[PDB]
Every structure is written in structure tokens, then in C-alpha cells.
Amino acid sequence: SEPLQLASEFVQDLSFRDRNTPILDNPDYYSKGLDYNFSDEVGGLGAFTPFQRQQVTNIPDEVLSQVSNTEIKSDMGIFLELNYCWITSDNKLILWNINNSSEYHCIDEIEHTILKVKLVKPSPNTFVSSVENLLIVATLFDIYILTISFNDRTHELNIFNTGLKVNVTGFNVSNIISYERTGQIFFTGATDGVNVWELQYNKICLTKSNLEETISQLEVDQSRGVLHTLSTKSIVRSYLITSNGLVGPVLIDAAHIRRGMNALGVKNSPLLSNRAFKIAKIVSISMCENNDLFLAVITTTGVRLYFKGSISRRSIGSLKLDSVKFPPTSGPLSTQKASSTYINTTCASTIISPGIYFTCVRKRAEHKLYVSAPDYGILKNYGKYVENTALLDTTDEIKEIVPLTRSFNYTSTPQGYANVFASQYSAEPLKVAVLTSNALEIYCYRTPDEVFESLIENPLPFIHSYGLSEACSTALYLACKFNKSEHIKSSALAFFSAGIPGVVEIKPKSVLSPRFYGSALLITRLFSQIWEERVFVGISITRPQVEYYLSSISVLADFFNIHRPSFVSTASDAESIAMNALILLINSIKDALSLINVFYEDIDAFKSLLNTLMYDSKTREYFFDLKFHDLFTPNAKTKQLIKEILIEVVNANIASGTSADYIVNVLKERF
Predict the structure, then answer these.
(1) Rounded Cα gap, residues 638 and 87, in angstroms
(2) Are residues 107 and 136 in contact, defined by beta-carbon separation less than 8 angstroms?
(3) How far apart are CA 277 and CA 140, in angstroms?
(4) Domain 1-20+447-671 - what CATH class?
(5) What is the DSSP string of 394-407?
(6) Cα first-last separation, the chain
(7) Could you tell me which residues are beta bridge partners of residue 316?
(8) Domains of the chain, residue spans
């Protein structure tokens, strides 16, 4: 009955709903073929284009000039962690900043032909455990380990030799990879078959697979600690990484795959025939994304094969083919079974979590780049799996494809994992780097707001795909959004307030209107990360974060304070009550964040005061377990505690000038 608790309950119900959206992959989603929204032209999907090319950065001349002379071996790649690229020519290695390309560092401490470079995490129990990353360099004779870090002043890259050096003369190292949880480094040699070695550094290398020709790829399941190897004969071997070594392997081969396909009821695909069969790429799947799925296999025909598995303490089960996705054409299974759209697919192809498929196709006429992104909104709105698949701009041969940012997954559980609509505001904007022989190309993911923006003259397909509530939420966002044309803002506001006159109405029925649910969704998603987190530990969130949240909620506060008489003052009155409660909630959140903002002006003094103040035991305990939502909708105890605290911030000389005045204004008004 009380507004703040009511709004709080709404917010929490919606947060629950956001955390429990369908799991990304399920065999039932596409057992009878993949529902594609496909275009073989750049920009062809129009509004629902998942990615757009935003820049092309050439490999700098000053960098290429030091690669000019290369008699034997050249290679290049992207360092996922550093946002740096690298080139090797014979014995020299050059790293260059993706965000600069005037800033480059050479490694000259290397005598012989470089075979492999790799970025890796340090082991937890070492003298270099503090460093962010290690750079492993393997040549014909040695493995060198360097540290890479950032200077805290000139902000340039520091690269230091650790002094670690490992003899690998008869190896010809061909692959390097790490298990990050332990910092273990596994590697292969081109002259040691399918054997897996390990490098330990407290220098020695030891075999793990000694008492299917050679290994072409190593892949680690970081969430489970599983090691997959892909060999030149398209055989996958999986091992459980344990403290006492590798347990396995379990195998996937062409025969296993034929058995699986026949068991799935899908028979005689020309793309999976014994002649046409070869594996381009394998990519592990996190148990956070799917509890059962262990591994995706990309074939040279562009087919995705999904395998489930199971692991115990010292054992690993054989992988079973759970599902298959065929290329798009132009159920549809029967035609997708024989689609040649992705013939042939190269090993530069990859899958970026969650489920985003970058397909590097080489025709026999020419390089084409495709991307397939699951339509998350459709999945959570309808429980239906649809991929938006489009041709991309890149025409040059693709060397590597790597995400430059963290994946925008919403939860760390299969439920709600791919809810990008909930994480669109908090997650880092997804950018994907495509390295070719001439340039680095950056592709940016298009969020719901941009989709709605493309559909500003007619948001009907947005509503159709994503639902009316999401449409109102995004319209509110765009109506408040900074740096937009007046046309876009006024159109978004018009939709939010009136809907589409004569076509779509926004109103409560006898449930509340999608305008209310949209607004509430915005509030819930903005404060998703800090809602259930404790306020005091110092304060659990930094000062720039506090200013961020405060600014955001201030924008919303002003918005609703202005357009209030249109929403407030039986279904209609229920709507009025809910909306009023929500607006009060917004203002309250603003108030709390404002007090925290005041606290952040002299944080050392405030920490001191908190130390001396922190009063029987149950109250200091009640204080240190206060969550942000406890401050957003405070009970009497919280209110009196905060009152006392402010009283001390003023009584003692912490709050300076306008701060303290603002505080006594607060104590006077709402205390």
C-alpha cells in the first residue's frame, strides 16, 4: 500500500524476470531447421542488422617497414586483453596499439625464428603473480616468458623479461594455451604428434599424454577446466585438467559425428559426408552459458555441431552430439542440409559468447564475411530461436577475429545468460576486431536503442519482435538520451506517451500499461548491478560510479517530474498509483545517491568517522549489511541511522560549505 515498498516489489519482480529468461541453446529450438532472418547484402537486414563496421585501421607504415624483410616466416594476430596487435617476421616481434598505431613496441631480446606467441595469465603462487598478463614467445630453441603491464603515468606498455627461459630445441612449438584458474600453460610441438606438453615455472616442460597426425588447435574450457585438442585429421580429444595431470582423452571423429547425426534423425547431409568433412574451428562453451553443452564444432562447410558432456572429479564422459545448425540458404532443415552458402569456411571463423557466429567464407571463384547473431529479444519474448544473419563489409582475407571487450552476458547462469536487453545499459558496448593482412576492422554490435532508432518512423516491427513493454522502455531511454536530434527525442516521447494513434494504444486493462512496465524496466536495469550489493565495506562503489548513477537518475527524475501530470491523478487509478509510486522511487534513489555523493567529497574523513562510529553490535552489523535498496526505500531504523550519520558529518568538520548546508537542508526537509 505504501508507494516505495510497492515500487520496490515491482522492481524486484522484474529483476527476477530478467534473470530467468530462456537458455540460449536447446535442441528443441531448431530440431526441424534453423529459423533464419538472412541477407546476402551488406545492410540487408535493415533495422535488425546485428553488427556495423565503424572503422578500418591500416597497419601503420612505420610498423610495416620493420616487417619489410622476411625470408622465412611471417604471422600476425590480436591480443584480446591488451587491445594490441602483433606481427612476427623471422626473429622480430612488434606490438602496436589498436587505439593509436603510432605507439609500437619491439621485442629485440630474441635471437632466433619465432614460432608462436601467446598471451597468458600468471600462476597465483609466483613472483610475477601481480602482473596482468604474461607474453609467451616460442622459437626454434627457446620459450621466453615476459611480463606485459601498463605504466601508470605515461600509460604506455611495459614489457620485462622474467629471465625464465625453456629449452624446446627438438619441439617446433606449434600451439600454446593456458588454463587461467591455475595459470597452467599447455603447448604442442609440430614434431611430437598429438602429445600435449606442459610448461611449469615454479623451467621444465613435461609430457601429459605419454607413458591424429599433428595438433592444429588447442582450446581450453575455462569454466570447467577442460582441454580440447584439434588435430590435422579432424579429430577432437578432450581431457579433464586435474592437479595431477590430464585425464583422458575422449574422442570426436567423423564416425562419431555420423552416429550422432543418424541418432538425431538428420541423414546424409552432403556437407557432412565423409569426403566433404573437415573441422575448421572448435570453440568451448561455458557452463555459465549452458550446463550441458561443452563444445561447438565449426566445419569447413560452415556447419555448427554442438556436443554435450559431463565431468566428475577424476573422469570425463564421451561427448555426445546434441544438436546441429546448417548454413542459411537465401521445416527448412531439408534445404539447409545442403546449403553451400558457407563453402568454404576458414579457421578464422569463431563463436563469441553468447552464440555470435562469425563465418569467414572462402569461395572457389573470394573472401566473404558473415555474422549470425541470435535475436535475444525474440528468444525472451516468444521462447523462439531466431538468428539474424547478414553479410558484412570485409572483403579481404581474414587472419583473426577477436572481441575487444567483455561479453555482454547478463547473468553467470544459463537462465538469463543471453538477456542482452537487461545488460544493454551496464555491459560494455561489444566491439569485435577483424584482422586482415592490410588492416584491422572494428565491428560494433547494435543495441535495442539503435534498432528502435532505425524504426523511428514506424516502431511496429520492434513491438512485434520484442513486445510493447520493451518498446516503451527503449522509447523512454531515447526520449531522455543525450546528443539526439529533436525529431528522434520527440518521436520517442510521442510513442511513450500516446503510442501509435489509431494503431497501437498504451493503457491498463482489466494489468498495468506497458508504459509503466517500460519505465520500471529502465529503473530496474539501471540499478541491476548495485541493487542487492552492500553500501558500506569505505563505499562499495567508486566515486565516478556514484556520479554516473546520480547523473542518470537525475535525468530520469527531471523527465518524470516534468511529464508527471500526463501519467498520474479501477485500471486507470491502479496505473496512477503504480506510476506515482515509481516516480517517488526515482526521486528517493536520487536522494540517496545525492547523500553518497556528498560523502564522497572527503572520503578519508568519512572513513574515519565511520571507523569511530562503527552502537551495540546488532546495529553496526545492521549497518554493514545495508544494501543500496535499503537506502532507496528506507525503513525507520535505516532512516534514523542515516540521520545520526548526517548529524555527525555536520557536527564534525567533514562536510565543507555547500555540502553541510545541503545536509542540514536534508535533515530539515525529509528527516
Answers:
(1) 58
(2) no
(3) 33
(4) mainly alpha
(5) --SPEEEEEESS--
(6) 22
(7) 311
(8) 1-20+447-671, 21-446
